[PDB]
Design a protein around this ligand. Structure first.
Ligand code: NA
Ligand code: NA
Length: 93
DNA sequence: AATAAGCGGAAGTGGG
DNA sequence: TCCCACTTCCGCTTA
């Protein structure tokens, strides 16, 4: 199954949920979620995964937190804002 | 308070 | 066996 960071990168590429997530500085890999519309995107992640429970933004962000140590996604010091690693961005493209 | 978000340990589930 | 890659639940903290 697809990994969370790849699900997010693919959404940013397609623009299919542009009201829920957007690039801040695409060259640096920084992106941000919508305060009001992030839950719809979290719901989509859970359905893509076939998880037992309904996915929430909180649970999705809890999963994102685990990428901080390995480096795929880091939290930026701004609400709802994250940054993909250069490895993630280059391999995706 | 109400609302929202952040922090993150610990235990549970998936598919190797 | 035992790690992967999260998921789920909980309690605390900050704005
Ligand atoms: Na445990
Ligand atoms: Na605030």
């Amino acid at each position: 199954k697809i990994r969370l960071y790849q699900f997010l990168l693919d959404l940013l590429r397609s623009g299919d949920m542009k009201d829920s997530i957007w690039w801040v500085d695409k060259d640096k890999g920084t992106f941000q979620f919508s305060s009001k519309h992030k839950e719809a995107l979290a719901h989509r992640w859970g359905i893509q995964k076939g998880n037992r429970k309904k996915m929430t933004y909180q649970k999705m962000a809890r999963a994102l937190r685990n990428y901080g140590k390995t480096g795929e996604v880091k939290k930026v010091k701004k609400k709802l804002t994250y940054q993909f690693s250069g490895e993630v961005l280059g391999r995706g493209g």
